[PDB]
Amino acid sequence: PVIKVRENEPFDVALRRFKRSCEKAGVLAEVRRREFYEKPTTERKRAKASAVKRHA
Amino acid sequence: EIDYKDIATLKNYITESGKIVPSRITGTRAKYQRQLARAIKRARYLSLLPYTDRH
C-alpha cells in the first residue's frame, strides 16, 4: 500500500490515506493471524463456525 | 474463454497490491472466477503482471 503525497496536500489527509489504504489492503490482520501456528483441524472449525454465524 | 495474454481485462480484477479480488465483490460467476485466477497466475509467471508491489 504505497501512497504518494500530492501537491499542497496537508499531512493529516495523507496519514488518513495511508491508514485507509492498509486497512483495506489487509496487512495488520494478515500479520496477526500468521503469528502463531494453527492446526488444520482448528482452521476448519473456525471456518465452519464463521460460516454458520453468517445467518441473517 | 479467459486468456492470460489479455492484460487489460486481467488488470480490472486485481488490487493495487496485486491480490486477486474475490468474486463476492466483483460479481464474477463461479465458473469464470476459477478461469480468471488460473490465467492471472500464468501471467504472473511471464512477468506480465506482478505478484506484489515491491518486487
Binding site: - | 486468456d3 495474454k5 487489460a8 500464468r42 504472473r44 506480465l48 506482478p50
Partner: protein
Amino acid sequence: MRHYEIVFMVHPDQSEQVPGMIERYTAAITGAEGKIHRLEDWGRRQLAYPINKLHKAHYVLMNVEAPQEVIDELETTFRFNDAVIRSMVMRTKHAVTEASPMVKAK
C-alpha cells in the same frame, strides 16, 4: 500430434538474433510434418518484476501443431540456450490462428 502454445522471452542484448532464432525452430517443426498456426514477435517489453537484474525482455509467441517428441526437444534447446531467459509451453485443445491481443494492442 497435439496443439501447443509456446511463449519464450529472450535476453534483450541478443534481440537481433530473434528472427534467426524463430526460423531455426520452424525448420525443426515443419520438418516433423507439424503445421504452424501463429508466430508473433512482440518485441521489447517492460517486465513487471526484474529477472536476472533485468527489465525489457524480447517476447516471441507461436502456436504449433506437432507431435510430442518434437516439443520435448524444443525445451532441451530452451534449457541449454543461454539466450532464452523464460519459456512456457502449454497444451491447447484446438489450433488457434486469430490474432492475439498483443497484435491488436499496436
